[PDB]
Enzyme design. Structure first.
Site, PDB file in Angstrom:
ATOM      1  N   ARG A 276     145.113  42.918 -61.117  1.00 13.54           N
ATOM      2  CA  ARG A 276     146.464  42.806 -61.685  1.00 13.54           C
ATOM      3  C   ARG A 276     147.562  43.413 -60.824  1.00 13.54           C
ATOM      4  O   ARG A 276     148.732  43.381 -61.204  1.00 13.54           O
ATOM      5  CB  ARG A 276     146.517  43.466 -63.062  1.00 13.54           C
ATOM      6  CG  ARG A 276     145.662  42.777 -64.102  1.00 13.54           C
ATOM      7  CD  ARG A 276     145.362  43.648 -65.285  1.00 13.54           C
ATOM      8  NE  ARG A 276     144.567  42.890 -66.233  1.00 13.54           N
ATOM      9  CZ  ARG A 276     143.265  42.641 -66.112  1.00 13.54           C
ATOM     10  NH1 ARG A 276     142.547  43.115 -65.097  1.00 13.54           N
ATOM     11  NH2 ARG A 276     142.709  41.769 -66.933  1.00 13.54           N
TER      12      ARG A 276
ATOM     13  N   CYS B  87     147.430  44.530 -69.329  1.00  8.72           N
ATOM     14  CA  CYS B  87     146.361  45.436 -69.714  1.00  8.72           C
ATOM     15  C   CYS B  87     147.054  46.733 -70.102  1.00  8.72           C
ATOM     16  O   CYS B  87     147.415  47.543 -69.238  1.00  8.72           O
ATOM     17  CB  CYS B  87     145.353  45.672 -68.606  1.00  8.72           C
ATOM     18  SG  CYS B  87     143.971  46.691 -69.224  1.00  8.72           S
TER      19      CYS B  87
ATOM     20  N   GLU C  96     144.563  42.753 -72.913  1.00 10.29           N
ATOM     21  CA  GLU C  96     143.804  43.942 -73.207  1.00 10.29           C
ATOM     22  C   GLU C  96     144.816  44.928 -73.700  1.00 10.29           C
ATOM     23  O   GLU C  96     145.939  44.964 -73.208  1.00 10.29           O
ATOM     24  CB  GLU C  96     143.083  44.490 -71.987  1.00 10.29           C
ATOM     25  CG  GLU C  96     142.027  45.536 -72.340  1.00 10.29           C
ATOM     26  CD  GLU C  96     142.618  46.847 -72.792  1.00 10.29           C
ATOM     27  OE1 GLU C  96     143.568  47.316 -72.139  1.00 10.29           O
ATOM     28  OE2 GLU C  96     142.161  47.403 -73.809  1.00 10.29           O
TER      29      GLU C  96
ATOM     30  N   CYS D  65     139.342  46.090 -66.430  1.00  6.91           N
ATOM     31  CA  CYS D  65     139.512  46.412 -65.021  1.00  6.91           C
ATOM     32  C   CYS D  65     138.352  47.286 -64.493  1.00  6.91           C
ATOM     33  O   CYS D  65     138.512  47.843 -63.423  1.00  6.91           O
ATOM     34  CB  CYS D  65     140.838  47.197 -64.799  1.00  6.91           C
ATOM     35  SG  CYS D  65     142.154  46.958 -66.049  1.00  6.91           S
TER      36      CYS D  65
ATOM     37  N   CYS E  23     140.306  51.689 -68.613  1.00  7.68           N
ATOM     38  CA  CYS E  23     140.115  50.312 -68.944  1.00  7.68           C
ATOM     39  C   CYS E  23     138.679  49.834 -68.714  1.00  7.68           C
ATOM     40  O   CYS E  23     137.979  50.295 -67.801  1.00  7.68           O
ATOM     41  CB  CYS E  23     141.096  49.455 -68.186  1.00  7.68           C
ATOM     42  SG  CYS E  23     141.178  47.801 -68.918  1.00  7.68           S
TER      43      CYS E  23
ATOM     44  N   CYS F 148     145.204  50.178 -69.458  1.00  2.55           N
ATOM     45  CA  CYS F 148     145.412  50.468 -68.043  1.00  2.55           C
ATOM     46  C   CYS F 148     146.815  51.026 -67.897  1.00  2.55           C
ATOM     47  O   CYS F 148     147.026  52.007 -67.204  1.00  2.55           O
ATOM     48  CB  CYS F 148     145.386  49.160 -67.242  1.00  2.55           C
ATOM     49  SG  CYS F 148     143.881  48.627 -66.340  1.00  2.55           S
TER      50      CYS F 148
ATOM     51  N   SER G 256     149.712  47.277 -64.503  1.00  2.00           N
ATOM     52  CA  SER G 256     150.376  46.867 -65.720  1.00  2.00           C
ATOM     53  C   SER G 256     151.541  47.748 -66.060  1.00  2.00           C
ATOM     54  O   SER G 256     152.401  47.317 -66.825  1.00  2.00           O
ATOM     55  CB  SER G 256     149.415  46.803 -66.895  1.00  2.00           C
ATOM     56  OG  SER G 256     148.178  46.223 -66.518  1.00  2.00           O
TER      57      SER G 256
ATOM     58  N   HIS H  95     139.303  51.849 -61.385  1.00  2.00           N
ATOM     59  CA  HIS H  95     139.817  53.210 -61.597  1.00  2.00           C
ATOM     60  C   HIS H  95     138.856  54.254 -61.017  1.00  2.00           C
ATOM     61  O   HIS H  95     139.308  55.296 -60.539  1.00  2.00           O
ATOM     62  CB  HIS H  95     140.118  53.531 -63.074  1.00  2.00           C
ATOM     63  CG  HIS H  95     141.296  52.784 -63.648  1.00  2.00           C
ATOM     64  ND1 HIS H  95     142.604  53.106 -63.360  1.00  2.00           N
ATOM     65  CD2 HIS H  95     141.346  51.740 -64.511  1.00  2.00           C
ATOM     66  CE1 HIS H  95     143.412  52.294 -64.010  1.00  2.00           C
ATOM     67  NE2 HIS H  95     142.677  51.453 -64.720  1.00  2.00           N
TER      68      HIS H  95
HETATM   69 FE   LIG Z   1     143.812  47.126 -64.587  1.00  2.00          FE
HETATM   70 NI    NI Z   2     142.641  46.931 -67.592  1.00  2.00          NI
END
Ligand SMILES: [Fe+3]
Ligand code: NI
Ligand code: SF4
Ligand code: SF4
Ligand code: F3S
Ligand SMILES: [Mg+2]
Lengths: 543, 261
Positions: free
Chosen positions: A470, A537, A19, A69, A66, A540, A493, A73
């Site tokens: 992740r 990602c 991503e 994900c 993102c 992210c 990430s 968040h």
């Molecule tokens: Fe993420």
């Molecule tokens: Ni993400």
């Protein structure tokens, strides 16, 4: 094993099947990578865009960091404001928030293994060469017995692909590194066919998995059920939805076990040489699936998937996370000078771009360091820490894997390891669904309390911790004037793929890339293999 | 060719719209991809990487017979569009290229259509919509992200039947024709002046209207209550107000999400 004599630089831009926008630049000496650079290519703002805004609105802006994900968040942000606000969300909120995250782990790791990573080990064109009857026997010997692994099921898959290929309109397979044969691809056609049948299956299974999440989360992508103080989805507490949820979840878990894990173990058997390529030393986990999500300390301590920081690869010393130790430098990042070494609560986002391939400034991600060192976060970190702590489930599964693979455990410190870990925990989250669901089905039925009362502080600060698919995610806030003075995100990430710290020290990905064998510089699948194992990602990471 | 060629571009985005596209059923993603269109470029799922990916892109755009352009994400305009790059090129530069000979342009998501979240104040990257950036009419499928039902719908319809009936902001009227609030199953509470004062209150547990909690369904155009997401739910049914995400510049126009002004 396969390795060229190639000496010179290779750069992969764009890095696809990840991503976001990532440019990777390595220097190769005799077919092995000697140095690497992780260059994140897009900056959005987010942290800046959030300054001065209403704390209650943050979860909505940050969730957009993102779309892969999703929710995490909004969760991390909700936990963050719950902290600054000093609200202790009710029992059912914790259960529902933790359940949606499990649903996310489920959807995320399935899609990543098949749609994002698989193409690095599987040769789809060689699936055209396998005989379905011979394939089905192998499937019958290596996987759970399924009608989907039949001679006729496999055959139709092969007939669908064949037609498509023979159409001349290859689409996403256009220019694939495996077109024409590639020395890096070891799987026998039978396994290429099996994996490819399951790849198409996972396209449908992931829909069903994102549908279960939407029951509790309002919808996917981008859940709309969390609110400061808890959740708002009172219906997610009821009998029919929960029943349905439990059903879809069960059906997603049958695939994890009949296809996902077997495939993962299958691919792993043929590529055991990858159990010794791309390893790191340090691991960090804030943990997830806590039983007392009333504060960050209570999260770290009570997480069913535990917390810890493993340094060196000392699995005998899983230390505790010191949130005050976390910080981020901006030396090799595209930000103004002067901001290296900021703790999240004092973070500074001053974008200052230079040029492409600067070496001194090459990424929009900052470089998060712990007590001066880089940390790998995510499935491998979680697995290692959880195992080191004697987490039952992890012990069973990791040993089942270490065993079927006949490799040590020291072998997990690699790309092969990272890859398997993602599967290992999918098997564990799947192992816990029924239990977790029954707790909330029972609590909801007795008392449906989903949101606690709270009050906006003039000045305050808080942190939301979570271990997304992740890795280590934290959202830090400074409320001033009953508004956002500072809102900083340090994402999984960013830990794994950010650039170097001010000490010139490589990040986990840049370190894992060194020693990577390049069988063919023109089609560098190996670079992608290590990079995708980290499940990058970039959206992210940079936000 | 035998299957129409679609070129998909990713600019300033979160990939929530590629994720929404694959949430489609009727048809499922693979079907659409193997039987209907010919997705020739899509970085999120394409096998080739690096130069090979750009060769694939080139091939698509040089295709003997045209292509349809799907743009996801807004365009990073600041510093010559260098804050957003792909293959060592700025995103603007490349949409400029692809849009040039594109049989059609479909903007998936509120970001591409209208600039997005990155365009929210203070807009550090100086991002803008594909339309504002290129200066061409585009078929907007807004939402954060849009319902696959709407995207796949527009794609297919654009390939078969042609360009659909668009409203003032370029959204196919078929989907962005009725206010969310008008189809909201909570309308009777809204009319009866029965509002939920808090998410912890009995009214909220009872399903009272979420206007007091800042529901923008009353000023939002979308088919969420009628169509649902994942064949299972939608924000208001999850007891949470609508953020007005299918509306232009919603990040600043609907801002205090939990207030009515
Ligand atoms: Fe993420
Ligand atoms: Ni993400
Ligand atoms: S419109 Fe929303 S979901 Fe789509 S890419 Fe933009 S922020 Fe993401
Ligand atoms: S909940 Fe919202 S969209 Fe529904 S009736 Fe109320 S104001 Fe309208
Ligand atoms: S927030 Fe968006 S998804 Fe629909 S319910 Fe509202 S227009
Ligand atoms: Mg940051």
């Amino acid at each position: 094993t396969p390795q060229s004599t190639f000496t010179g630089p290779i750069v992969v831009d764009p890095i696809t099947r990840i991503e976001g926008h990532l440019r990777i630049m390595v220097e190769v000496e005799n077919g092995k990578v000697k140095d690497a650079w992780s260059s994140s290519q897009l900056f959005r703002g987010l942290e800046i865009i959030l300054k001065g805004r209403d704390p209650r609105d943050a979860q909505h802006f940050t969730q957009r960091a993102c779309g892969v994900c999703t929710y995490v968040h909004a969760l991390a942000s909700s936990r963050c404001v719950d902290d600054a606000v000093k609200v202790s969300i009710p029992a059912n909120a914790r259960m529902m928030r933790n359940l949606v995250m499990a649903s996310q782990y489920l959807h995320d790791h399935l899609v990543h293994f098949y749609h994002l990573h698989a193409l690095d080990w599987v040769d789809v064109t060689a699936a055209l060469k396998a005989d379905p009857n011979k394939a089905a026997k192998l499937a019958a010997s290596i996987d759970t017995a399924r009608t989907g692994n039949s001679e006729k099921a496999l055959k139709a898959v092969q007939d669908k692909l064949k037609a498509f290929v023979e159409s001349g309109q290859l689409g996403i397979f256009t220019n694939a590194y495996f077109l024409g044969g590639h020395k890096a691809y070891y799987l026998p056609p039978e396994v290429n066919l099996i994996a490819t049948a399951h790849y198409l299956e996972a396209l449908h299974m992931q829909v069903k998995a994102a549908s279960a999440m939407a029951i509790l989360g309002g919808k996917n992508p981008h859940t709309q059920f969390t609110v400061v103080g808890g959740c708002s989805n009172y219906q997610g507490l009821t009998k029919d939805p929960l029943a349905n949820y439990l059903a879809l979840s069960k059906e997603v878990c049958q695939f994890v076990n009949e296809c996902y894990i077997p495939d993962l173990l299958a691919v792993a058997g043929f590529y055991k040489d990858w159990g010794g390529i791309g390893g790191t030393s340090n691991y960090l986990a804030f943990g997830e699936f806590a039983t007392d999500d009333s504060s960050p300390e209570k999260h770290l301590a009570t997480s069913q998937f535990p917390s810890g920081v493993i340094t060196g690869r000392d699995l005998g010393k899983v230390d505790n996370v010191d949130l005050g130790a976390i910080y981020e430098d901006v030396k090799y990042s595209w930000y103004a000078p002067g901001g290296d070494g900021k703790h999240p609560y004092d973070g500074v986002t001053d974008p200052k771009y230079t040029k492409l391939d600067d070496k001194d400034h090459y990424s929009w991600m900052k470089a998060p360091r712990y007590k001066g060192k880089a940390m790998e976060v995510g499935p491998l970190a979680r697995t290692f820490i959880a195992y080191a702590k004697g987490q039952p489930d992890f012990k069973k599964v990791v040993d089942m894997v270490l065993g079927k693979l006949s490799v040590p455990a020291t072998a997990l410190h690699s790309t092969l390891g990272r890859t398997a870990a993602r599967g290992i925990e999918t098997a564990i989250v799947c192992a816990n669904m029924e239990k977790w669901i029954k707790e909330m089905a029972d609590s909801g039925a007795k008392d449906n309390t989903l949101c606690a009362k709270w009050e906006m502080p003039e000045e305050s600060k808080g942190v939301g911790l979570a271990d997304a698919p992740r890795g280590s995610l934290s959202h830090w806030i400074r409320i001033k004037g009953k508004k956002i003075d500072n809102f900083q995100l340090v994402v999984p990430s960013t830990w794994n793929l950010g650039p170097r710290g001010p000490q010139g020290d490589k990040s986990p990905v840049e370190e894992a890339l060194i020693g990577t064998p390049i069988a063919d510089p023109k089609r560098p699948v190996e670079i992608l293999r290590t990079v995708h194992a980290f499940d990058p990602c970039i959206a992210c990471g940079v936000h | 060719k035998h299957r129409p060629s679609v070129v998909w571009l990713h600019n300033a985005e979160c990939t929530g719209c590629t994720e929404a596209a694959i949430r489609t059923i009727k048809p499922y993603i693979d079907a659409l991809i193997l039987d209907t269109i010919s997705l020739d470029y899509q970085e999120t799922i394409m096998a080739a990487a690096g130069e090979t990916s750009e060769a694939a892109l080139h091939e698509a755009l040089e295709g003997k017979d045209g292509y349809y352009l799907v743009v996801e994400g807004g365009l990073p305009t600041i510093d010559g569009g260098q804050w957003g790059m792909v293959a060592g090129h700025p995103m603007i530069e490349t949409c400029k290229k692809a849009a040039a000979k594109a049989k059609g342009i479909i903007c998936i998501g509120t970001c591409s259509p209208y600039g997005g979240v990155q365009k929210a104040k203070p807009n550090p990257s100086q991002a803008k919509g594909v339309s504002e950036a290129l200066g061409v009419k585009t078929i907007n499928i807004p939402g954060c992200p849009p319902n696959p039902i709407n995207f796949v719908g527009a794609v297919v319809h654009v390939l078969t039947k042609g360009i659909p009936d668009l409203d003032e902001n370029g959204r196919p009227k078929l989907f962005y024709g009725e206010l969310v609030h008008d189809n909201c199953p909570r309308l009777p509470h809204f009319e009866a002046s029965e509002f939920a004062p808090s998410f912890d209150s009995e009214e909220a547990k009872k399903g009272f209207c979420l206007y007091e909690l800042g529901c923008k369904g009353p000023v939002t155009y979308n088919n969420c209550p009628k169509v649902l997401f994942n064949q299972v739910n939608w924000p208001v049914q999850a007891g949470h107000p609508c953020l007005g995400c299918s509306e232009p510049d919603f990040w600043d126009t609907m801002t205090p999400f939990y207030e009515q002004g």
